[PDB]
């Protein structure tokens, strides 16, 4: 069946927004970095590796606002043993109603696709914020593209997107504004 259960009472009337993790909200690496925001131990083949995570500028303000404007859902092509701890440390305000990982993506011709139709929401009221266009090849008309982030601390894309999301949260059909 569907990836998500019915939307909770207070969320039922909100637009559902799937938010990507890597290169969208944070950037991680196995190469030690002094200014990492999070260091997370990830076990692979019995060996514990340390992953250094950097937060994208304004992500906290971004997640807090989005959390109250939409029914936010984390959808990533990364493994839970990596992404679950990051989301635990990152999402302080419980903006994420659900979290979906690699196993929930559809592997289609070399790419892990975020197939929005498996979500179980009315696509007229669903949006995806992902840095990789290949992620939403099945629903390019629900996409609110955002540039890939790695470490540019001068980035302000998340901050500047809020006005747009503020407007979308009001419409009753995202296609009406996203062309479809």
């Amino acid at each position: 069946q569907y990836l998500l259960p019915e939307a909770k009472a207070q969320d039922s009337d909100k637009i559902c927004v799937v938010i990507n993790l890597d290169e969208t909200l944070v950037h991680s690496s196995f190469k030690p970095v002094n200014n990492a925001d999070f260091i997370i131990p990830v076990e692979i083949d019995g060996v514990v590796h340390q992953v250094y995570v950097l937060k994208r500028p304004h992500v906290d303000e971004f997640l807090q606002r989005m959390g109250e404007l939409f029914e936010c859902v984390l959808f990533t092509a990364s493994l839970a043993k990596y992404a679950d701890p990051v989301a635990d440390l990152l999402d302080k305000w419980g903006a994420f109603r659900a979290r979906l990982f690699r196993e929930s993506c559809v592997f289609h011709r070399g790419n892990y696709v975020k197939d929005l139709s498996r979500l179980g929401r009315d696509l007229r009221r669903v949006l995806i914020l992902d840095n990789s266009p290949a992620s939403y090849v099945f629903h390019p008309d629900n996409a609110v593209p955002v540039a890939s982030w790695f470490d540019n601390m001068s980035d302000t894309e998340l901050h500047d997107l809020l006005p747009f999301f503020e407007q979308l949260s009001r419409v009753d059909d995202v296609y009406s504004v996203l062309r479809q």
Partner: peptide
């Protein structure tokens, strides 16, 4: 790969 491919 643990992160997004």
């Amino acid at each position: 790969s643990p992160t997004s491919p």
